[PDB]
From a paper:
Analysis of the cryo-EM data of PRC2AJ1–450 bound to the H3K36me3-modified nucleosome resolved two distinct states at 3.1-Å and 3.5-Å resolution, respectively. In the first state, the H3 tail can be seen binding to EZH2 and entering the EZH2 active site (referred to as ‘tail-engaged’), while, in the second state, density for the H3 tail appears absent (referred to as ‘tail-disengaged’). In both the tail-engaged and the tail-disengaged states, we observe JARID2K116me3 bound at the allosteric site on EED. Consequently, as previously observed for activated forms of the complex, the SRM is folded and interacting with the SET-I helix of the active site, and the SANT-binding domain (SBD) is in a bent conformation (another conformational feature associated with an active state). Of notice, in the tail-engaged state, R504 interacts with the backbone of K36 in the histone H3 tail and R497 forms an electrostatic interaction with the backbone of the nucleosomal DNA.
A central mechanism of PRC2 activation is the recognition of PRC2-trimethylated lysine peptides by its EED subunit, resulting in conformational changes within PRC2 that lead to the allosteric activation of the complex. We discovered that H3K4me3-containing and H3K36me3-containing nucleosomes inhibit PRC2 using two distinct mechanisms because of the differences in their positions along the histone H3 tail.
Residue numbers in the entry:
A (entry chain P): 179 to 295
B (entry chain L): 80 to 441
C (entry chain A): 81 to 152, 156 to 167, 182 to 223, 228 to 254, 295 to 322, 351 to 362, 426 to 544, 556 to 682
D (entry chain B): 108 to 120, 138 to 166
E (entry chain N): 4 to 93, 106 to 410
F (entry chain C): 17 to 181, 220 to 339, 426 to 746
G (entry chain I): 19 to 40
Write the structure that this text describes.
Amino acid sequence: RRRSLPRPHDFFDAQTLDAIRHRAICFNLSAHIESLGKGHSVVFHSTVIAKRKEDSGKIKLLLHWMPEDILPDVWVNESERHQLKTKVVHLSKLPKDTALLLDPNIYRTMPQKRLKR
Amino acid sequence: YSFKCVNSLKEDHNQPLFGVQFNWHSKEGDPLVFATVGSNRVTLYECHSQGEIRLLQSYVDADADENFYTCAWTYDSNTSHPLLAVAGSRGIIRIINPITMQCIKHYVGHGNAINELKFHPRDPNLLLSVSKDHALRLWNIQTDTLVAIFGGVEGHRDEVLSADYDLLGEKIMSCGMDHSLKLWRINSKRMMNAIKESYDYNPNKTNRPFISQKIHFPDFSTRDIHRNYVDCVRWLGDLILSKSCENAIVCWKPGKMEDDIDKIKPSESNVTILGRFDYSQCDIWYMRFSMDFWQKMLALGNQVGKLYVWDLEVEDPHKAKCTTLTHHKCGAAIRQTSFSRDSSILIAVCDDASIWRWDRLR
Amino acid sequence: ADHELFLQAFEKPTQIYRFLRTRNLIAPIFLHRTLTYMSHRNSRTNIKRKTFKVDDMLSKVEKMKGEQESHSHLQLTFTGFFHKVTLEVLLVKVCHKKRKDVSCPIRQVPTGKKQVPLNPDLNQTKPSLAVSSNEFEPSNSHMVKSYSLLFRVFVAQMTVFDKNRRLQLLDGEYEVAMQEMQGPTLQFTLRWTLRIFYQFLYNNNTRQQTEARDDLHCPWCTLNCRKLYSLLKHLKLCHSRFIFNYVYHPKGARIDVSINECYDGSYAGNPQDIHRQPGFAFSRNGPVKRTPITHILVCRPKRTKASMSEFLTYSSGHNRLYFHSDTCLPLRPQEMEVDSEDEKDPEWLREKTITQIEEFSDVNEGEKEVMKLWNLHVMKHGFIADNQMNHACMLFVENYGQKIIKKNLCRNFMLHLVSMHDFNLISIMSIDKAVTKLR
Amino acid sequence: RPRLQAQRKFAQSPPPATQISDLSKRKPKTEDFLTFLCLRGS
Amino acid sequence: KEAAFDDAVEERVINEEYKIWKKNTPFLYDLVMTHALEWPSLTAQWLPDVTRPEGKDFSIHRLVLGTHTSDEQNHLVIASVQLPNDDAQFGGFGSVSGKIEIEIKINHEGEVNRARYMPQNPCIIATKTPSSDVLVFDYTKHPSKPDPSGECNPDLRLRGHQKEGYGLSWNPNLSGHLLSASDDHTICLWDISAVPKEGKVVDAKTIFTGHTAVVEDVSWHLLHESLFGSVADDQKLMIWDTRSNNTSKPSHSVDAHTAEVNCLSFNPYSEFILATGSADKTVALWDLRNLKLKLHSFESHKDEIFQVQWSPHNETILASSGTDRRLNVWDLSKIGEEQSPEDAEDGPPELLFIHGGHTAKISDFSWNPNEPWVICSVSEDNIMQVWQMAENIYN
Amino acid sequence: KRVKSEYMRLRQLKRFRRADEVKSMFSSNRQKILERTEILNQEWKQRRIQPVHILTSVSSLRGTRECSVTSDLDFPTQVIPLKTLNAVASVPIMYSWSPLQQNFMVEDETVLHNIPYMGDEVLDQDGTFIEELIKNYDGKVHGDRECGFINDEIFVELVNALGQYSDKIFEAISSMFPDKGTAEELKEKYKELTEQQLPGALPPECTPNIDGPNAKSVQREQSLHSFHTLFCRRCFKYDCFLHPFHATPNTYKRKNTETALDNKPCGPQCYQHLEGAKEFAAALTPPENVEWSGAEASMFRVLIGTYYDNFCAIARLIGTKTCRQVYEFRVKESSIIAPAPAEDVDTPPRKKKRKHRLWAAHCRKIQLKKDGSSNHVYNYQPCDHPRQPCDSSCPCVIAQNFCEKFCQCSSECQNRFPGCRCKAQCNTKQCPCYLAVRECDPDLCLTCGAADHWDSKNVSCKNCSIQRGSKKHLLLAPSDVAGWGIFIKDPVQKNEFISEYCGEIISQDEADRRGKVYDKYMCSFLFNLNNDFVVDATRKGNKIRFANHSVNPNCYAKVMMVNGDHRIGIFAKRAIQTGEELFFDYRYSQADALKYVGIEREMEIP
Amino acid sequence: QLATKAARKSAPATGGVKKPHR
DNA sequence: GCTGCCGGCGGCTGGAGAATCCCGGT
DNA sequence: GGGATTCTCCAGCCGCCGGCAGC
């Protein structure tokens, strides 16, 4: 401890701070984390798309989720209607292969251009 | 020449403005765009007809406690883009490209706050900075090399806060708080070789750093012109204009009447006064007088905000002119004025974060 | 008093840590189950032998039990369009992202074309057919990811198989909605053939207080910290931008937070990057030299037990960017070489010792030039000892013989040598030798 | 007198401790702040 | 453009991540040692030999490294690094002067792509250059101080390739048998048992051109003299049995993963276990008895992978490195173990430890002999890290 | 007086003529201005530049700060979003300084150079500091009460008109104009007006250079007067930059008998081989009238002062005469010259070894008498003793300093330092040079290698580095304590020389004058040197001026005598390895130390 | 005058001499 | 218990001040 | 008789170590 050591000039400049501010604002308006996901969950809004009628007395319907995340389409029985209209899962449970589409700054290959492999 | 207040701008951040400069590099018929400095922000504006002034893009260095006060316009020799140089109390050199909306060059190394920024009239890539460091620096732009340091033993022994460029681009002069008006040369073979080698330096090609030229001895130096802070300088062909806190701009030349500037010996000790310009209420330093491109009129702002306009014609300095362009809201002190590329309009800045526009009606 | 400074200061870390939470949740820097103070996590132990030669039997049994079913070539007929024109049928097959490709390529191959009525209605008809070809092979399917069908008239796309090649499309008549650029829809048939508080103090002038809802969870990274010790350790180790104190509110605990004063967390990579102009800083197009350093962060921690009372790494080498003495420019690693930018003989003072010589009125230039020449000569070496003058004068001759001969100042030079001899620095046996060696 | 005077540059001249929702009030202070109630945690 | 802006933002956030990891490492490791090389290295392997000086609390180990420079003289560097071998001792642990020093430097003919020591004779190591040849160096025959004359003449240089590439491994049971991988779609074999008449030049004895794409891996089955694995950009892993006299017909061929794949390692303590990782962000393993069935897919990576190494002294522990700037530790003993919801949120049970102490793409990593639990890793940020995870993690 | 009124009366016509001149001057200047501006406009006309566009709201910041540029008129206020500039790693404050490897005396500037600028806030309630400073300079600030300016023409006219109706006029001119400030300039102007002529570049006694066409026959003393007066013996430089000119000339004793004096035939035209000249050679102990030029005669007079008998060497140094011609000129002119002095000394004592014991006796006398006030170490000055010995009236003895080789003590002066005798490394207390802190001069300690190997830098002696200036490689970077700092590159062991603290030499009162503003700046460079001089590194010096204070530092400063000069060397208080910042105690008073240096860089360990 | 004294950094040092052998 | 704390304690360093050797002529 | 050659004598310093005030 000492009186006043030099300030190391923190590396996070305001130029990236404003970008982070916009990214957080748009991401919260697109995922409702702090409001509905309790700070740890991304929301998805479904709607009936395809109403398929199977060989037996069963009807399956697609529900497509608005954020268009890594999840693929899933057949849902008509019995589950009005139950999975709004669905909430934790951020860690998204498919790892194409979860980077949620935010470009989640991960990028920093050496995007390489002179050697 | 008669100028009328057609419009007034106030940044309303209540911080003194400095260093207003027109973009004289704009081609014929291009929009009239000039730069102005306020606090940690840099502001550009466009001048339209009928006094309308449009606000252009503005930049802010909010990352640290900063106070900018300088502007200097230059063009990119490669991509023809217009570039702007900004410096502040933090001793930071900033290059802003309004076309790309971003800063793509910055220079550090100055020992203290910068005070005046001016570009070489012939070579756009040579950039000169005036600093509290008690020294002068000339920066290169195509390469990031720095080759000049004007100061030291026989340099200014206190803060330097003004410099001017000759029309031909071969001679600089400096003034500071030490009552000293000092002269520097570029036409010297050593400076020409240094400037040529500045473009011929590749940092990756050689391990040795660039050999920056330290210069401690001005070609001519005098201290008897002013008994106070000499704080702004402009050139008059070979004759020299300089102002101080003695409420009077002085015109003078080195040597005697028949003494040529090229023939001035380094050990010259005799100066020659030429003329005087009179004004009142100049009791505060760091006020600057501006000159048009054609060197035909003189302008100066005052602490009471009154403008002093005099032509540079054959009129004797004793009774050259007496013009006081005033408005009832000019109570704020003026720091610097700017002339358009063809002296058509003039822009002034003040301490109250206000911008004033003056349009000529011949 | 405008509190905007407080707002900005305490907003500065909010964005950084809220972004870091989402960044770490998708991919953590480290496994939080492996942290020492997070012991309630990672309930699994390391006790397991698991000889490898028997894992194959378990894998084979699982594979045998997992042989669920195989796909049945497909045919489909199209019912009339419905709205509140010939149809285009294309099959889209997607391959995995290869090294050369920027993203995952798609192959919208056409299976043919057919005509459809211009928005017909039911009970009016009294039929187009599309058939698939199985000419492909599993070797070709090795590079493919999934399968889907695209229909255009107005574009729709559905997938037939899941990620694990699980069939999602049995045989039956299916109705699908239509999205352009309820509403439009299409029909078709398919057949196979304690309470915690937080206080935000600001210079003791004013403060803002909150309450920790969803207790034992971090307000910033939303980490489940069951124990107060683990919560405080995580806050003081990961959320280092803030300083926290323990107060023990009667509700059970109290944590007063404040912005870190020093927080020596500036740029830690190659220090020369930050000074470089944009477009070259962090270029990463190739290797960037840096002066070697060495830091040890962990050597042998004591590994003490949990201690609530605990709350109330050296470096060797150039750990900073060095600068030029005169120009204050950053010092490149190659510029750190034997060039010490400080030698015995500055040029400015050489110039000054020449300018000040001419100031003396009662000296002729013939002596002034010799004075300047000899001053520069001595300054080039900085002689100190008196015995050097034999060698010093000889080397002065060997250096400036041409200059003095062209200046025609040899007589003034021997006058200078006589002046030296009057000071007992030069012997009489050296003046003649210096003169003889001049020619 | 005038030659020694100080040369001057310028002229002579919250009560509710609501919750950690203050953080959700902090970062998005504008552009559709969430929960519609963090404004009480001003 | 927009790529540069996001690149700068991600550089800042990566620096923040690295600082947070530096602050959290005392509660995560039992040993952390970092040093910045003057030039980045594309190779990281420990020499088998070790010395334990008596009367002090450290032991000296040597690292096999290389130099990758933008524009400078290129060297082969072997560094001596001293490690604390005491539990109660804690300068940092020993002397104050320095823990890492460079002891061997040999001039190079270009970049150092890969370098692997011969296990039987560690004094002779082979290296791969961007050129079409393989260089064999014996540092006992070369001075520590690099000659200013430039490229030093190697003991032997091996021809047979025509393009750059780096997949290397020495024969664990015989001396001089070298199989190497290059982008020429060819794998070349040299016999350096004894070739005095080489004149520093040795041609390939056998050229393997089985794959139709770029091959970047070669590793021997450590319990067989004739079986080795080969990997290609062809998305396949392919095992060759020698003495078959068929450079086109392999012993086996199996489609490994969905994208370009290059890293393969044989478990030292098993006769049939083979594991590999791919650019698909997966690490997968197979059985040599039945190559057509995949045992398991380790899925926690987020980017390309170009190194997989089996941990000595721990057969059931596997580690892999990739461009994700993380070093992962895998434990087969935890396949399919039920875990608490927080443990599941952290990751799969089979993932034992992930290392966050890097700012750039990791080029190579290695587990050392003579020490069961410390790991070195070299990345493209010119930083070298030697680390051991906390003892509380295992046992 | 009415000097201003008379100046204005003459300036009526003077300014009439001046206006006549400056009208043409302005016309010519404007013509050249038109031509130069025409050239510049032509160079500008050839270039096309992309115009700047307005700033559309970037998608990078939906919620950010926007500036509303308002107007006093009816124009609407314009609002635009600010673009955030990228941050730049700045550097600490460091004023310009010239590099310096030696020391530098500054002539005492009795007048204030210029009033420095300050914060413009503290002086609002404590403006008396300016009055205190001007009282320190006693009102002498540059340009004070200048009453305008004089170009030496109006002043000359007033002096000429200032008849008896010299000294009073000179005093009035000095009072009304600080540019002269002395009656010496007024008397010089009076003499110039009375004579209206100048002797030339030579002094009033015209002494042109020998090689010049204006040769003259001048005796040796006047010819070499300039060399003797301006040459500085101590540090081997004409017009010493670290030594005053107030010293005795080269008039001193010398060894007269130091030649073989063997008669030999010095060529065909020799002084010998001639009966008359051979006889005259001993006596002085057909002469042709050769055209002995003035330069030749003056240089013969000079050369006769170094041998007094050797016609061979003198004539060999004469291009215009031979040895026989040298003898003929001797018989012609030097036969009427004054007889040679041929002076010599006795020097009875021969016990050189025993001199150290008596030397130590004088040191013991000093250390027993003046130890109470021994802190007043006085700057060394070479004392000149005309006839008296190195007695209690000797200037060096009263200065309590040993007599260096530049002294005018006898060859065996009891106060003269005889020199160290260490056979090896002499940084131990066994070395006499270390005890009484000094650097082994390279003329006395020949055994320790200080004299030997002056070219190379491999010397066993560790007490001669300051003389050789073999400072280590040091680097500059921002400090971890305050402002800039200095960091050593290579490792250095304990008690090893690293560098010298060079700077400007100034008097105690001048040091106080500079420290008066240094205290206000809160940053100082004043290094106390001795009881007379203070070395200041504010304007010149080297990288070392950045070294920071520390109560527990790793280096120590030592003021040591180096060939009769107070020099400051820095040494490592302990072993220091690569990349460390150097610190030493400033020896400040505790209150002043805490006021000026209040950073410790570390808390208490216990 | 010179009533006030500026603060100068210093480096004090004093030295005796060695006693001869007896 | 253990913290400086301190003075002796032998162990060592290097100046320096005398005891020893040889060459050369008488 | 001198001069080079050793060669111990000494005063001071350095590291260690065993009591001596506290706890």
